[PDB]
Amino acid sequence: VMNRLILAMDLMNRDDALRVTGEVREYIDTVKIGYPLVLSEGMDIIAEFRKRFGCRIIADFKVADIPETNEKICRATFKAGADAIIVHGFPGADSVRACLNVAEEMGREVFLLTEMSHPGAEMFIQGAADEIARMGVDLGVKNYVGPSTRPERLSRLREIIGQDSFLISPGVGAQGGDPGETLRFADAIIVGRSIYLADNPAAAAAGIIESIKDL
Amino acid sequence: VMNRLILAMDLMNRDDALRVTGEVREYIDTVKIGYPLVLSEGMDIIAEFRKRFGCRIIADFKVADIPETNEKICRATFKAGADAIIVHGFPGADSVRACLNVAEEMGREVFLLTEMSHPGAEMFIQGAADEIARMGVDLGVKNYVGPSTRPERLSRLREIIGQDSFLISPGVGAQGGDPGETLRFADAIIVGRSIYLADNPAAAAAGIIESIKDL
Ligand SMILES: *c1cc(=O)[nH]c(=O)n1[C@@H]1O[C@H](COP(=O)(O)O)[C@@H](O)[C@H]1O
Ligand SMILES: *c1cc(=O)[nH]c(=O)n1[C@@H]1O[C@H](COP(=O)(O)O)[C@@H](O)[C@H]1O
């Protein structure tokens, strides 16, 4: 990813989302779009962004349903133009395999979310996260998501998935995570609020990048 | 709910979804709409359904994000007219509380999904489900979702949440669950494919009700 930085575009109205993404485009090549924006402006916003910015789009839908419904969600998401979709591994292997089958059919990618970055992740997800990561490896998953807020857990996740797997990580900035430390284990960092709520989003992105390039 | 039956309307195009829902309307008073229909036709479909059928609408979005994003998803969903939203409990208590706070602000309801109905639920969710249900009780959750495919687990969930809590249950029909046995513990059953893929959806719904009324 350009500059190893992925923008989490979670503003909820089209005009502000387009403005901020355009302001930081020279510093990124990948935008993560989720439900806050899609449920407010429609799935057509994915194709609009992909075209307008010529960026790769990751649909962060944290898919967490039964196999049959996960297939339908993945199919609609790829039909809308997304390059990849983020899927929860907590619901099990069949649910993840349903997503992988659709990505294979459509020439796209699945990112497996192992451990989440917020405090509540410690209650149930953290204890199952190493096993969720191993399950991903056993299913042939090559793209993963792990927590910036717990670099020791990000390290253990990297250990399980190997150096060849691609690992992205949210929780940088607003949630407390550090760009440099996170990039010791992740290939790219996801940043949302630290950039999109900034008085000058481009300056915020530029500052993050400067603290990175020094790695 | 009318006849203790909730329709899971997971068809992906508006015309077929409207046709089937209209054909079975005399047998239900609540429609569960999820991402297969919303991501294909837009969030406006919720208000259209609520108005056209005068039914209560549960948005089955299996919300599974961090607190801040969960708040945004719930706000967009209630703004769209949904009466309730289904939320995963596995991300932890703060993620669930974020949904409860928005529901309180907007005069709506949250349903907490404890254990899922598909096979993969046995891998990680089942082992945490009793605790997820207890967490719900501690947070003051009054509406829950549990699996028709495992009535012994549905019984244990009912035991934890008490008789005053409202419990709905998917996995009836296509996934193997039985209407009557599930209703021994759940207040209402959720049915999707057994009705919407039937040659005559009204006859399928009527047949299910026949079993129910006999209880
Ligand atoms: C998903 C999973 C996870 O573990 N942590 C997260 O924060 N997310 C999503 O990533 C974005 C973080 O953005 P920000 O905290 O930098 O504003 C956001 O889209 C969240 O839903
Ligand atoms: C959600 C959670 C769960 O544990 N099980 C489920 O099946 N779901 C959703 O409920 C519907 C079941 O429909 P059907 O199997 O009768 O067709 C569906 O919307 C699924 O996503």
Swiss-Prot record, chains A, B:
Question: What Gene Ontology biological process does one annotation of this record name?
Answer: 'de novo' pyrimidine nucleobase biosynthetic process
Name of the molecule in the record: Orotidine 5'-phosphate decarboxylase
What this protein is reported to do is described as:
Catalyzes the decarboxylation of orotidine 5'-monophosphate (OMP) to uridine 5'-monophosphate (UMP).
Which PROSITE patterns does the UniProt record give?
A: OMPDECASE
State the taxonomy lineage: Archaea, Methanobacteriati, Methanobacteriota, Methanomada group, Methanobacteria
NCBIfam families (alphabetical): PRK13813.1, pyrF
Q: What GO terms fall under cellular component here?
A: cytosol
User: What are the entry keywords?
Assistant: Decarboxylase, Lyase, Pyrimidine biosynthesis
Kindly list the positions annotated as binding substrate.
10, 32, 60-69, 117, 170-180, 192-193
Q: Which cysteines are joined by disulfide bonds?
A: none
Question: Residues in the active site?
Answer: 62
Q: What pathway annotation does it carry? A: Pyrimidine metabolism; UMP biosynthesis via de novo pathway; UMP from orotate: step 2/2
Q: Subunit notes for this chain?
A: Homodimer.
As for family, the record states: Belongs to the OMP decarboxylase family. Type 1 subfamily.
Please state the Enzyme Commission number of this protein: 4.1.1.23
Catalytic reaction list = orotidine 5'-phosphate + H(+) = UMP + CO2
| Species the sequence originates in | Methanothermobacter thermautotrophicus (strain ATCC 29096 / DSM 1053 / JCM 10044 / NBRC 100330 / Delta H)
Which CDD domains does this UniProt record tie to the protein? OMP_decarboxylase_like
| An annotated Gene Ontology molecular function | orotidine-5'-phosphate decarboxylase activity
- Which Pfam family is one of those matched by this entry? OMPdecase
